[PDB]
Design a protein around this nucleic acid. Structure first.
Length: 908
RNA sequence: GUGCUGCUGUCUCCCAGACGGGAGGCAGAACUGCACCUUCCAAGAAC
DNA sequence: GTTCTTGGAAGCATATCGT
DNA sequence: ACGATATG
């Protein structure tokens, strides 16, 4: 719930006393992870050190329960299951037995304990009893418990019988009803545990002994890991049940006898050494009496008509059902249990100030942290190697059982930070010892005016919400690849000069400051990153074709043309007809590609290590191009290592577990660095301008009508999942006190921000956008225009809609489908009714007319005629896709005829 | 401290199979640059 | 060639009896 | 006051 940040410090050597504690803690943690799973009478799977999944059947779990101390782990199965469910938090969140999963150690791993007998905190009972006993009227208590409540806690404390509870209170400050409540409000888990102790199963035998705090830390880590495993396993079971449902759905749609005949066909085809796959099913479904390509003749041309004529017309759906069944039969039935290991899957050996783990004293001196750990054996003083994250630390103890640290995070700026440390954690990574300083952090307050403004601006026009009522500063973002970031900021109360934009129910605002960020830092390096990436992309295809050339002599016609038209030119090579020589030429080409990759990578490293340092930028397009080059080189190398797959199209999965490990590592690390630097740039631009509210492009959805952001080689979606990017930028803008919203990008890249009409984005000068103003042709930067459009959409609350879907009623009219509340708001404001239809006009356009609610059913009577259709807005009329592009093409032919010289430029 | 992140020399293990590729270790030289919540986890996709 | 929108586990509070 | 369980 709180805010968190962390970094690791390096402890050079740790005495043998702390080493032994680390290993014994890991041992006990593994023991608990094993014991909780065992307590469940449910088989599971383990990921062993070498990757092979064992299946621990009930035998090994029963033997483990026996070794742990249980004399007969057969009849006590149900109580153990209840306890396991309780400790892993699979119980009622209100009646939860163990709010923290480490509260169970004392009842389990100790001889003398009082769990389940103490009652001083169970409900508010004791506190309320003493409070009323502190000279407060019982009528007030009864009222506040019965009728003054609407959702308060007092309602949920009252598990007792009121007609008898209000008879107990006659006695002064009693505890008899307290014991009654203790034995009445039994939580199932703790009752099961008490039954187990009385039975004689508990105080189980632990591994190498430790004090209670170490046991609590081990239990916490084990419980965390097992709860993650349970969540993953539940999702796995859900997906497999969904697959079974899909199999049932597919099977219900065919004749079972025909499905059995198709099963016979598939079995015989497999006996013919052909495994059933979507590709061959589709190939066979093309034309049964015809001849399939050479890739399928061996398996098809000997079985296609051998008694399987009856299912020729149904082969398609029958193959679909067979594929569904064979997918369900092979998808994982569960998720394997990764298990704790001091060197293979370390846990955090944790130290806390309130019982969880053993205490520690965090100290600083001479620019380095001095950690002190109160191990049972004694006291251990460690010196941490200086860190530039926590530079020049200072630390003092607060009166809240916490340490307050003030430090400098080294950057261009050297801002001081302040956070609180309450838990510290050990870990052994690549042999060395580290401490995870997880520390708390309080961001900026975020003013109430900002929240009012956000609620106002994100709402549709048909929802009344209070006005911003303040001089907010809103800024837009347009995320991209080449220009990673473009912005435009307005002050919401001033229109001194610049591009103007309406604001909902306020004066007009001006985008005084607009800019471009990112872009090409160096031209040559970007061009070479682009070329070398293209070679790898096409090289893998050349390898794929060469392999099946060597296997089957000649390609099919179309795939052969692709080799000459696309692959050979784009993967510089002289195509040798000989099969043997193709290996050696391909290897030589891969050698050249690796040398070029090394050169480019070195130049990219000289960013910060040449006198040109000062002219580099926090983020440049090279980051994004370098990610694509790495991604494509991974594919090319993976194809080359797989060249000798003689079978040509048969699977040999498994093999090397590392392979291109260095390239995957580099890809992930460079992605992380790029995302971090990008978000730093956005946040710093926002702060420099005071943008307390930030409108953002919603990359989750792609505008199909755009030509730049739609393709694979230019999309951010190809490097990250869209959710991972905006969430990171959203979070730290918040941490700096800036609230941000996501706006739909539909037609923002191809609609004017001065005018409201469509235009042209150049296919050659990709960074320019053309439109018409005063019937003169002007141009602007295609990315600042997108930012202004996003901000304008945020500010006007989506007043102007550029696209509308419709369906063709047979009358010759189109009915508008409304599903987003912005559509309803627009259709209401422009016409006056919730729904409307587009009526043709003689000038080859359709006009909105609006409908009364009654005729909606009449329109629905015919709406089923056709599919959804797109319609686009121009100069106050609406026109169709085939004619929308015509108007854009007219502007295209006009611009190429006019030239850049006669075109004025808008400022940016 | 973790990355961005490399170079020279040099040793070792794998897949080729005589064209090449892929895990790692060790010793040097060049630069004092830019960022930094981590941990635990199994656009690609349909026809 | 023509279109569409991965989630989970964690990173401590305070109360009370006895010296 | 502070320490050792105990459990929101």
């Amino acid at each position: 719930m709180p805010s968190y940040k962390s970094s690791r410090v390096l402890v050079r050597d740790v005495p043998e006393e702390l080493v032994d504690h680390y290993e014994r803690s890991h041992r006990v943690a593994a023991f608990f992870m094993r014991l909780l799973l065992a307590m469940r009478r449910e088989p599971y799977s383990l990921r062993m050190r070498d990757g092979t999944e064992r299946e621990v059947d009930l035998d090994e779990t029963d033997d483990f329960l026996r070794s742990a101390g249980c004399e007969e782990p057969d009849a006590v199965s149900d109580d153990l299951r209840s306890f396991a469910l309780a400790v892993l938090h699979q119980d009622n969140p209100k009646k939860r037995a163990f709010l923290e999963s480490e509260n169970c150690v004392s009842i389990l791993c100790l001889e003398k304990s009082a769990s389940g007998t103490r009652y001083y905190k169970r409900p508010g009972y004791q506190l309320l009893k003493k409070a009323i006993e502190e000279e407060w009227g019982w009528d007030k208590f009864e009222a506040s418990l019965l009728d003054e409540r609407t959702g308060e806690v007092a309602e949920k404390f009252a598990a007792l019988s009121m007609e008898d509870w209000r008879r107990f209170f006659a006695a002064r400050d009693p505890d008899d009803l307290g014991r009654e409540l203790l034995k009445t409000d039994t939580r199932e888990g703790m009752a099961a545990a008490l039954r187990l102790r009385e039975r004689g199963v508990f105080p189980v035998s632990v591994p190498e002994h430790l004090d209670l705090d170490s046991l609590k830390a081990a239990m916490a880590s084990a419980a965390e890991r097992l709860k993650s495993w349970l969540a993953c396993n539940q999702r796995a079971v859900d997906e497999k049940s969904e697959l079974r449902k899909r199999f049932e759905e597919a099977l219900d749609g065919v004749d079972p006898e025909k499905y059995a005949l198709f099963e016979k066909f598939a079995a015989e085809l497999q006996q013919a050494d052909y495994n059933v796959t979507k590709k061959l099913v589709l190939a066979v479904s093309a034309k049964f009496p015809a001849t399939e390509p050479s890739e399928f003749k061996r398996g098809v041309e000997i079985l296609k008509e051998d008694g399987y004529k009856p299912l020729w017309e149904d082969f398609r759906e029958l193959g679909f059902v067979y594929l569904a069944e064979r997918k369900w039969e092979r998808r994982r039935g569960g998720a394997a249990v990764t298990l704790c290991d001091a060197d293979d899957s370390p846990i955090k050996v944790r130290f806390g100030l309130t019982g969880r783990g053993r205490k520690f004293v965090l100290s600083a001196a001479g620019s380095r942290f001095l950690i002190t750990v109160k191990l049972p054996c004694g006291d251990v003083g460690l010196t941490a190697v200086p860190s530039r994250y926590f530079w020049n630390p200072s630390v003092g103890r607060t009166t809240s059982n916490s340490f307050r640290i003030e430090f400098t995070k080294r950057t261009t700026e050297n801002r001081r930070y302040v956070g609180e440390v309450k838990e510290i954690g050990l870990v052994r990574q690549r042999g060395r010892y580290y401490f995870f300083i997880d520390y708390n952090f309080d961001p900026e307050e975020v003013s109430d005016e900002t929240k009012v403004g956000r609620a106002f601006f994100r709402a549709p026009l048909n929802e009344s919400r209070p006005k911003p009522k303040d001089k907010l500063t809103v800024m837009g973002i347009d995320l991209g690849i080449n220009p990673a970031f473009a912005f435009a900021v307005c002050t919401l109360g001033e229109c001194q000069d610049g591009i103007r934009s309406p604001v909902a129910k306020m004066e007009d605002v001006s985008f005084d400051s607009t800019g471009l960020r990112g872009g090409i830092g160096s031209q040559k390096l970007h061009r070479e990153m682009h070329n070398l990436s293209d070679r790898c992309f096409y090289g893998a295809r050349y390898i794929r074709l060469s392999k099946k050339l060597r296997d089957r002599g000649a390609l099919n016609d179309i795939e052969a043309r692709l080799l000459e038209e696309k692959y050979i030119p784009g993967f510089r090579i002289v195509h040798i007809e000989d099969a043997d020589e193709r290996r050696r030429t391909v290897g030589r080409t891969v050698k050249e590609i690796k040398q070029e990759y090394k050169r480019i990578r070195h130049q990219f490293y000289l960013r910060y290590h040449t006198s040109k340092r000062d002219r580099t930028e926090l983020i440049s397009a090279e980051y994004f191009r370098m990610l694509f080059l790495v991604k494509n080189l991974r594919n090319l190398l993976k194809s080359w290592n797989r060249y000798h797959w003689t079978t040509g199209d048969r699977e040999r999965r498994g093999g090397n577990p590392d392979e291109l490990k260095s390239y995957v590592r580099y890809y992930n690390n460079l992605r992380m660095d790029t995302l971090k630097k990008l978000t730093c740039a956005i946040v710093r631009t926002a702060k420099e301008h005071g943008a307390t509210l930030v409108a953002m492009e919603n990359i989750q959805r792609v505008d199909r009508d755009d030509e730049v952001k739609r393709r694979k080689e230019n999309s951010l979606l190809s490097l990250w999942a869209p959710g991972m990017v905006l969430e990171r930028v959203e979070q730290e803008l918040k941490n700096e006190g800036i609230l941000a919203w996501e706006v739909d990008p539909r037609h923002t890249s191809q609609t004017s921000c001065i005018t409201d009409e469509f235009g042209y984005r150049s296919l050659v000068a990709k960074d320019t956008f053309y439109f018409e103003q005063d019937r003169k042709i002007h141009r602007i930067d295609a990315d600042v225009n997108a930012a202004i459009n996003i901000a304008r959409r945020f500010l006007t609350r989506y007043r102007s809609l550029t696209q509308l879907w419709a369906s063709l009623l047979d009358d010759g009219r189109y009915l508008v489908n409304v599903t987003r509340q912005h559509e309803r708001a627009y259709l209401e404001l422009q016409t006056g009714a919730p729904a409307a239809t587009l009526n043709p006009t003689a000038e080859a356009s359709y006009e909105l007319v609006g409908l009364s609610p009654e005729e909606e059913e009449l329109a629905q009577t015919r709406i089923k005629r056709k599919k959804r259709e797109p319609f686009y807005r121009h100069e106050g009329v609406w026109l169709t896709r085939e004619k929308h592009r015509e108007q854009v093409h007219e502007l295209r032919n006009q611009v190429l005829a006019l030239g850049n010289a006669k075109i004025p430029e808008i400022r940016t």
